[PDB]
Amino acid sequence: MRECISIHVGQAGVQIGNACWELYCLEHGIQPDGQMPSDKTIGGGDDSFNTFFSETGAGKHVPRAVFVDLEPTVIDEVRTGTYRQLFHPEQLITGKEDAANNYARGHYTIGKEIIDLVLDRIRKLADQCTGLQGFLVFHSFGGGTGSGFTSLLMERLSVDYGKKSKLEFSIYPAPQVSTAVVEPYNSILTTHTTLEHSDCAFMVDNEAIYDICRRNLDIERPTYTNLNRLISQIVSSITASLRFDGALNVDLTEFQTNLVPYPRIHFPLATYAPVISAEKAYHEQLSVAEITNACFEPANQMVKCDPRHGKYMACCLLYRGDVVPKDVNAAIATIKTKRSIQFVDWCPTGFKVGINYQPPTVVPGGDLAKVQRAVCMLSNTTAIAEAWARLDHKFDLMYAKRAFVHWYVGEGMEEGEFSEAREDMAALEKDYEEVGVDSVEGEGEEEGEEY
Amino acid sequence: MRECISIHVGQAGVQIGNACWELYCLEHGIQPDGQMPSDKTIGGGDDSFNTFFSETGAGKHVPRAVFVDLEPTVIDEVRTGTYRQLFHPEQLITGKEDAANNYARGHYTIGKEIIDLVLDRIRKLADQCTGLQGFLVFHSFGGGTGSGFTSLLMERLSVDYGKKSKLEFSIYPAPQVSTAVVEPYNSILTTHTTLEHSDCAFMVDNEAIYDICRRNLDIERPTYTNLNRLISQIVSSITASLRFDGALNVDLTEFQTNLVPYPRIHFPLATYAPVISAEKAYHEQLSVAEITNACFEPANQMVKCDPRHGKYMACCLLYRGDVVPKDVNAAIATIKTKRSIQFVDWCPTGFKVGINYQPPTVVPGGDLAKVQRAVCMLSNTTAIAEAWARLDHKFDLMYAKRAFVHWYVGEGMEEGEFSEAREDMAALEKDYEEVGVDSV
Amino acid sequence: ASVKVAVRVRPFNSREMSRDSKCIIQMSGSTTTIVNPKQPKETPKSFSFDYSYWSHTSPEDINYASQKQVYRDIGEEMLQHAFEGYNVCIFAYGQTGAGKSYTMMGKQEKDQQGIIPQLCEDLFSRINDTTNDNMSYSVEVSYMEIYCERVRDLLNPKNKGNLRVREHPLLGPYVEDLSKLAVTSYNDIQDLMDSGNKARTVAATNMNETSSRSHAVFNIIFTQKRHDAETNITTEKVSKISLVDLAGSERADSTGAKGTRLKEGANINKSLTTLGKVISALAEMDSGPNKNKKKKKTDFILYRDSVLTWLLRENLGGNSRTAMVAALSPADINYDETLSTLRYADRAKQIRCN
Amino acid sequence: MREIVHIQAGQCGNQIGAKFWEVISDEHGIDPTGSYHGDSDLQLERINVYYNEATGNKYVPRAILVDLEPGTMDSVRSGPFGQIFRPDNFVFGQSGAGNNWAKGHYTEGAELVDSVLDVVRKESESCDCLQGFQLTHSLGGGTGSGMGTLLISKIREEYPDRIMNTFSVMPSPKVSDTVVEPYNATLSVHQLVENTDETYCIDNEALYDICFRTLKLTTPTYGDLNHLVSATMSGVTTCLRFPGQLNADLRKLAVNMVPFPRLHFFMPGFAPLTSRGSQQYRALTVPELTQQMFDSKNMMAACDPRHGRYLTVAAIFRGRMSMKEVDEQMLNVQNKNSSYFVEWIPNNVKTAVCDIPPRGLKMSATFIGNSTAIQELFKRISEQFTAMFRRKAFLHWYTGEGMDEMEFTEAESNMNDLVSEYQQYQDATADEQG
Ligand SMILES: CC(=O)O[C@H]1C(=O)[C@@]2(C)[C@H]([C@H](OC(=O)c3ccccc3)[C@]3(O)C[C@H](OC(=O)[C@H](O)[C@@H](NC(=O)c4ccccc4)c4ccccc4)C(C)=C1C3(C)C)[C@]1(OC(C)=O)CO[C@@H]1C[C@@H]2O
Ligand SMILES: Nc1nc2c(ncn2[C@@H]2O[C@H](COP(=O)(O)OP(=O)(O)OP(=O)(O)O)[C@@H](O)[C@H]2O)c(=O)[nH]1
Ligand SMILES: Nc1nc2c(ncn2[C@@H]2O[C@H](COP(=O)(O)OP(=O)(O)OP(=O)(O)O)[C@@H](O)[C@H]2O)c(=O)[nH]1
Ligand SMILES: Nc1nc2c(ncn2[C@@H]2O[C@H](COP(=O)(O)OP(=O)(O)O)[C@@H](O)[C@H]2O)c(=O)[nH]1
Ligand SMILES: Nc1ncnc2c1ncn2[C@@H]1O[C@H](COP(=O)(O)OP(=O)(O)O)[C@@H](O)[C@H]1O
Ligand SMILES: [Mg+2]
Ligand SMILES: [Mg+2]
């Protein structure tokens, strides 16, 4: 069966999980207490789809998830809030000190002990599964647990399972805004784990989502709930092809197969087109061409890098709702006509297309308008290099003077490892700059004669 | 007695047989169920003549025929149609694949097995016969079964029986029109069987009959039923002398004796004069001279060859109806007067004449007008060479590049056999060009 | 631009000589003629060829095409071309029992040795004769067969489990896991030919009890390298010698069976048709450029229609030298088989009877 | 009796099969439950070509459904005609190839190939005289292309004598969904050239252009494309089920179309198509039928035959019509279009006529062209393939499944040789100067 396991690590992961599981419960008709009234109303169907929920004897539906954190505050907020009866009591909390915004504590000293419990719970959930497709890991670069413990967990998962997919929905640090001082060290030290082990990593930036909320939804003072709601919409759009039928359904394996040319360059950008307020929902048609055009605007990207500075290596569009292949094909043709969007010459086709009949849902108390059509775009492009390069600069400005290094060194981490990360980091950028080069020299060719 | 066996082979053969047996059933007063009401009305005579029908104890008349095909469609259509109760259930069908417009399949691979059943039924019918005169074989060049299985069947028949006559009423490919791509291969590969084995072979072309129907019988959109009806009329005219009395009755033996000067040039042309619509049946006399003149017109020939380009080696006229020898002789004299008709210098007489009293009949729902007089001409002439020559050209255009050859070679036929056929074909043409030369 | 055609008529064997047999084939110049024995009055069928070889009885001291004679005409030229670095190929065509195998192998008594033994003896002579310190000669011999478009090795004692055939873009067609063995004398090659011809795929039919159900190709890989006291070291001299034994043609008249027998016959006949078309097409462009020197495009000669021509591409196309010899039976009974063999040989630079 | 076994692979194959079986069931008067409720007696005369009999006077299609994602099988089963197929013929697995031709040819498809061949054998031994098979699959996909080629190979090894046709949907230059279409198309055309007697080529833009331009439909979906393809498939095998004045089994078309074994790729077409609202203005006669049939814009493969020469064509008509008119119109279209037909076939128009037209029409016709212009379909693909291979765009996904670059190069060379083959038959006429 099309089964997934969602691992939430860190405060950002836990809050993203809150928003995500709110959306899934609303999508599938599950009440906060786990019971589905619609089972006895319809009397058939698997609307409590196995992709995210496991059904027990009494009709209760337990989500397939594992929260993790090294601070009891946030997970206890989950454990006392509205959804306290939904989740299994195994929330895997370390009732001890935090990683304290230190990669070393989350990876080497404090990250131990809890790792065994986390792996045991993941093993149990995998055993309960039959046809596991992959893991979804939510975390945040720049945090303590979200960086180090996520790296350790990914290493152990890659060792244990090997072939199963592992996607990442991670929060990269922003160019200007930042809520920590030692953020670049933590962000850089995860390059090895997010490069070697993860199969496909999606980057989201809080500044980009703030800009989207300010411009599109017309919210002057957003908070993290809106950001988590948008990210949850994107995850639901990605995973919808597994759950609901459609004219063209894209499994995770197809999505990866079409998005990643080479095994080191798996960093696509996620965007959602019909992000519009209810008041502005009127005066608009929101046809297929409109949402496809909106997907390509640099203003609506979720990470602060302009694709116009780079080349579109690959694209995957996932439509939901009242959509027909004709308009999708026409929109793709119109996109290919424009010369502002550049494509590498070693990818003549350029696109992947999926269509799902189930339209998106509106969370009560949210801000997104009810719509009949939507699309989620995953674009693998070279412009992501920009988002890396800026952060690299900051790292140098700290590592030249060895600022804050003693905190990492005292916690059982060798100093030279710092430099190693940068080397890996640098190599990755070079790799991206290699795949933008528009064709080989092809110096060898011959001439012709006449007879 | 004057007894004949009619073998129908292929789809064209089966449909020609349908039309032919409709005609004879109407001629002799046989109902579709085999019974004759007139037997108890007249109380005498052999109106269910033995030339085509065998009479059982209960008064039923079973035709002397054997249909054959390698596809159950057409013979099943026969077996369910109006005349299902007429024929014996032995229709000799191979419930397997068709010959697929491929000579090799019809002769070598698929043609076997069914050959034994066909020969057994033919032997049974021959044993039931007393005074068998010859076999009539209907088929078509260019088809799969009609070419290969016909060749195999005639080889075995010539082996088993030998001295009995064997006539062809075969459909030759047209110059321009054609319903197949590999037609010339199949048509050329049968030159050996239609040359060595057959005693006399009549050639008919669909283009010529289409021209006749669109011009004489004022029909613009004809179908194969009209063609089969015309061919049936010709066969009936040929075979009438065996069944009905006449002032001069021309058996098959004397007809052959007069039409074939040498044993290799037995390819006459068949024509029928009073082909006219009932609306045009008025305003016309249709005397003996008129029909005799109309038979010689190149427009009314049934294969696209102009006799004016060649020489008339021999002619055999068979009249039906209110005809008297005085007008026949006068018409023959008038024909001999004209210089547009050339006769070879070594055939001073030139004509065979037969006269029969029974007039032709009109099929209900047909298109030929009722008439008091008619004539069928069988003219052996050199112009038939033209009809061969065109075909040879087409064959060359395929065989220079070995187009479609693998289909034949893969089915157990040696490639070089192709060339052999053309050599025989070429020799045949040369023979005709030899006999058109004036003596010295 | 070198395709020649050869024909060789066999003499009456012991059974034919003892029985009341008759001869129907005549020779003169380049023209071979055959007459139908039951109807010779019609016309003699004649064909012209580049090479022709006569034989009707055993001794035939004077004006006779001995094995050494056919070797000099065909074999010696091909061996010289192989020595000069050009790929070479010799086909032996004919019906079963026609005597083509006699030409290819010959008698082991060493009184009349076939083309293959004489060729290999001269090769071993040339190499040992021209063997010096700098020139390095190396020879490796392989032997293979095609049965129903499937390749089988004959020299290796392993199981006869059907193998695949592939093509390197630079190195041309090849076969996966085909054993090749080095040889240094006539004894080794003779042992290899015995071990090979003992393992051929044959079946009993109504024509001959050991009629070949498979084509057989004996390949010799010959290389000559120069390694002097210097740095500009190249080879520039590599050749392959192909010796092809073809299964005789057959008709459905003789192959009175369905299924495996008819399938094998049809596959075999398709292989001969492909080979004949390949050689005729090559011969047309042999005639053309040799006198025009006009480059009428590549005119690619199809070799995929069948596998036999595909693996022989390196020895068929390019600057290769190919010839074929057809075995003809002059006995009275084999008129139809013989005439079919003449027709098959007529192509590949067909020459008119002047 | 000639009886056909039908095989379907992938989403495209399954959907075309569903629509085609609906069309045939309505043609033969079969209810969705399998019971017969027709009027004419000819419908049961040769229903056994496609159907088998079951005891309670029930008819079961002789179809075999293949896939690796259960979603399509569930969609087919829970439908208007889902109950008609026998459940044992539904063959599927899990975790499909996902547009990876290696997975559906080596890793995954090897698991289900044995089960599918067992079902095929059971279907074939129940057939008293098998005529040939029939495969419907998408060429640019995953499980479809790969497992279809594997099944073709295994069936050709098992049943060499029987005919094998293929209604394949091949990639588009413009209407392209999957990014790795060229790899799958190349590695499949490597196999189609060797192990099939016929191969009807279909393109999505041709069907869309037919829908927008002729049928004047405003919102064509995959249902309409499946409708057109099903109409063509019904037209091809019409003569094996109904009587006529000239019959044409699948073999006669195979004999009369392909001149050489490799040139067995066809361009299908169907007529009439008149927009459902303009049929009142145009009369249904054989001249109009054949004029629409030979029109360049009607072809279902997105190739202009005016860029090449017709090696052969076959026209199969349905309905009561005069043979003379058909022959005259074929002569007319051959003579007027003198430059679009090769000369080394003097007459290269095969003709067949069937008495029973479609249910709601007076007369119709279907067309199978064999032209050199089809080479374009490969050349474009080859171009894209090179553009994605010389840099190794997505190569690792294949090589992790147990392949190597040599197979890619072999497939590319095979397709190029096919293209050159077809190219040699569009210029070489007859001469000595060249
Ligand atoms: C005169 C009349 O009654 O109306 C026609 C009609 O108006 C037209 C426009 C029909 C109509 O077809 C369409 O509108 C159409 C739309 C998309 C794709 C294909 C067709 C018709 O729907 C289609 C329908 O066709 C059939 O029933 C044929 O037998 C056809 N059947 C099916 O395709 C079929 C569909 C669903 C369920 C079962 C069968 C067929 C064709 C070939 C071989 C076998 C069967 C007919 C008669 C008509 C309508 C109803 C309007 C046409 O269809 C055919 C193939 O006959 C479209 O152009 C033709 C010509 C017709 O004039
Ligand atoms: N978009 C979004 N970002 C969040 C959210 N919660 C925390 N973050 C980000 O997380 C980063 C801070 O690091 P954390 O993820 O909280 O680290 P941690 O999981 O608490 O682990 P410790 O550092 O040991 O406390 C900042 O960049 C925040 O912007 C959230 O709900 N939504
Ligand atoms: N005059 C006339 N010709 C016909 C008739 N039916 C078919 N033909 C011709 O027959 C030729 C085709 O050969 P067929 O007789 O159909 O071959 P077959 O007997 O069906 O055997 P297969 O090739 O295996 O199908 C065409 O040239 C047709 O014109 C008919 O009723 N009357
Ligand atoms: N004609 C037609 N083509 C289709 C249909 N569904 C998908 N396709 C085409 O098939 C291709 C995808 O192949 P797919 O069906 O996924 O192959 P599979 O993975 O083996 O099932 C796309 O390029 C579509 O254009 C259909 O219903 N009809
Ligand atoms: N000078 C010669 N020319 C041609 N054939 C000859 C000559 N001397 C002997 N032969 C024949 O060579 C034949 C060899 O046949 P063989 O190799 O047994 O055929 P197969 O291998 O097909 O069984 C013998 O039948 C023999 O009569
Ligand atoms: Mg916490
Ligand atoms: Mg039939």
Author numbering:
A (entry chain E): 1 to 451
B (entry chain A): 1 to 440
C (entry chain K): 4 to 357
D (entry chain B): 1 to 434
What's the paper's own text on this?
These attributes are crucial for the long-distance transport of cargoes in neurons. Mutations in the microtubule-associated motor protein KIF1A lead to severe neurological conditions known as KIF1A-associated neurological disorders (KAND). Here, we present 2.7-3.5 Å resolution structures of dimeric microtubule-bound KIF1A, including the pathogenic P305L mutant, across various nucleotide states.
To advance structure-based drug development, we determined high-resolution structures of KIF1A harboring the KAND-associated P305L mutation in complex with MTs, using the same nucleotide conditions as those for MT-bound WT KIF1A. In the ADP and Apo states, it shows a one-head-bound open conformation. Notably, in the ADP state, the P305L mutant displays a distinct map with motor domain densities appearing at much lower resolution compared to the MT densities. The lower resolution can be attributed to increased mobility, rather than poorer decoration of the mutant in the presence of ADP because the classification method separates the motor-decorated tubulins from the undecorated tubulins, and the resolution of the MT part of the map is comparable to the MT resolution of other maps presented. Despite the poorer resolution, densities between the tubulin tails and the KIF1A K-loop are observed, suggesting that this weakly MT-bound configuration is mediated mainly through electrostatic interactions between the K-loop and the tubulin tails. The low resolution of the kinesin part of that map prevented us from quantifying the openness of the nucleotide pocket, while the overall conformation appeared similar to that of WT KIF1A-ADP. We propose that the P305L mutation hinders the formation of a strongly MT-bound configuration, thereby increasing the fraction of weakly attached motor domains in the MT images.
